[PDB]
Amino acid sequence: FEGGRSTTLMRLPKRGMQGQVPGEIKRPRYQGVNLKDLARFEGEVTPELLVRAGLLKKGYRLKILGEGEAKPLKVVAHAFSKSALEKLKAAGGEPVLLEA
């Protein structure tokens, strides 16, 4: 506030689309997690061994992806980035689909 001018509320809300009324559309959200860090543990990473670990957490649906080198180990996830899907094609897991 102040001057009695127009704050700098002159700049506009291109932020178009930010609120209907019933509310927010309940849809599934994805958690990053770069293979770069599953490298921490060597077993069978499952979105939970993750939450409990220290990454993702309740955010729900996990999408292992990104930077870092893969490792010889099965990775259950809800999604994979084209790139990590690859780096894991270097021998590992690809338990896509997921969910009942």
Partner 1 sequence: PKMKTHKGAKKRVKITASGKVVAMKTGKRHLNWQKSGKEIRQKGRKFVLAKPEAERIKLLLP
Asked if 9 is part of the footprint of partner 1 (rule: CB under 8 A), the reply reads yes
Which residues between 1 and 20 bind RNA (CB under 7 A)?
A: 1-6, 8-20
Which residues between 38 and 77 bind partner 1 (CB under 8 A)?
A: none
Cβ neighbours around 44 below 10 Å, total: 12
Amino acid at 68: G
Asked if 21 is part of the footprint of RNA (rule: CB under 7 A), the reply reads yes
Residue in the structure block whose two tokens are 């996990």: 62
Amino acid at 100: A
Q: Which residues pair with 62 in a beta bridge?
A: 31
Residues engaged in binding RNA (CB under 7 A): 1-6, 8-28, 30-32, 34, 37, 40, 53-59, 63, 65-67, 79, 81-84, 100
